[PDB]
Write a protein that binds this ligand. Sequence first.
Ligand SMILES: CC(C)c1c([C@@H](C2=C(O)[C@@H](C(C)C)NC2=O)c2ccccc2)[nH]c2ccc(F)cc12
Ligand SMILES: [Zn+2]
Length: 226
Amino acid sequence: IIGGTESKPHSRPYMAYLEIVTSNGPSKFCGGFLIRRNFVLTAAHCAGRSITVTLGAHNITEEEDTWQKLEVIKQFRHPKYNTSTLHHDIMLLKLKEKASLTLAVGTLPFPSQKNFVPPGRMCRVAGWGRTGVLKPGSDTLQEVKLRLMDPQACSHFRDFDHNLQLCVGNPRKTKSAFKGDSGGPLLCAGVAQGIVSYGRSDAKPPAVFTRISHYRPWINQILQAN
Ligand SMILES: CC(C)c1c([C@@H](C2=C(O)[C@@H](C(C)C)NC2=O)c2ccccc2)[nH]c2ccc(F)cc12
Ligand SMILES: [Zn+2]
C-alpha cells in the first residue's frame, strides 16, 4: 500500500497473509480474505506449488496468540485465467480445517445482491505489500481510501475490460495498491466489490481490480461442490 495509514490492529479480521512456495525460487507474498471458515479468496497469479495462510495478524514479524497459521489442501484457480491478458485473475483456497472464530478472525460473507458497481464513489483496500517502488513490504497492515474511476481512465492497460474489472485510484494522487497487495479486498461501504490484480511497474494510479460481481456464479459453484 502506497500513501496509506496503519490499520487499527485486528480491525479487519477477514484479512489473510499468503506465503507462496515455488520449486525454483524463494517465498513470494500476497493478500487474501476469508469468505467461509475454510475458504480464502485471492488472485490467480498468486498460485504456487503450496501456500500457507496466516489469519489474525497485524505486525507479521511478531508472533502472537491471535495468529492462526493454516494449511491449504487445494487451490482452485479460475479455469479461464490467462497469463497474457490477466483476464479472470481470481482463485479460491480451501483450508485443511475450518478456522477458529475470535475477535481477531472472522469471515466476510457476500450479501445476496450482486449489483454492478458504477464509477464515482470512494472505497478502501488493505495489505502488507510494498510502500513504494523501491521499498520492501510493510511489517504492519496498511490501508488507503481510493476513488472508483470511469473505465476510460484505465484505457492504457490495453487488456483492461469494464465488464470484468474495476479501475481504481485517482491519477492526481500517489495513493495506490502495489506488489504484495494482490489478492486483497476492495471494500465499498463495508462490502467487498473488488480484488487487487495489477498496475504499472512505477505504481502511478489507477490500478486494475477484478470485479467480484462478474464471478459470483463461479464462486458459488466451487463453494457448493467442495
Ligand atoms: C505489474 C506489477 C508491478 C504488479 C504485480 C505483480 C506481482 C505480484 O502481485 C507479486 C506476486 C507474483 C507474488 N509479485 C509481483 O511481481 C504481478 C501482477 C500480475 C501478474 C504477475 C505479477 N502485482 C501488482 C499489484 C498492484 C500493482 F499496482 C502492480 C502490481
Ligand atoms: Zn494483536
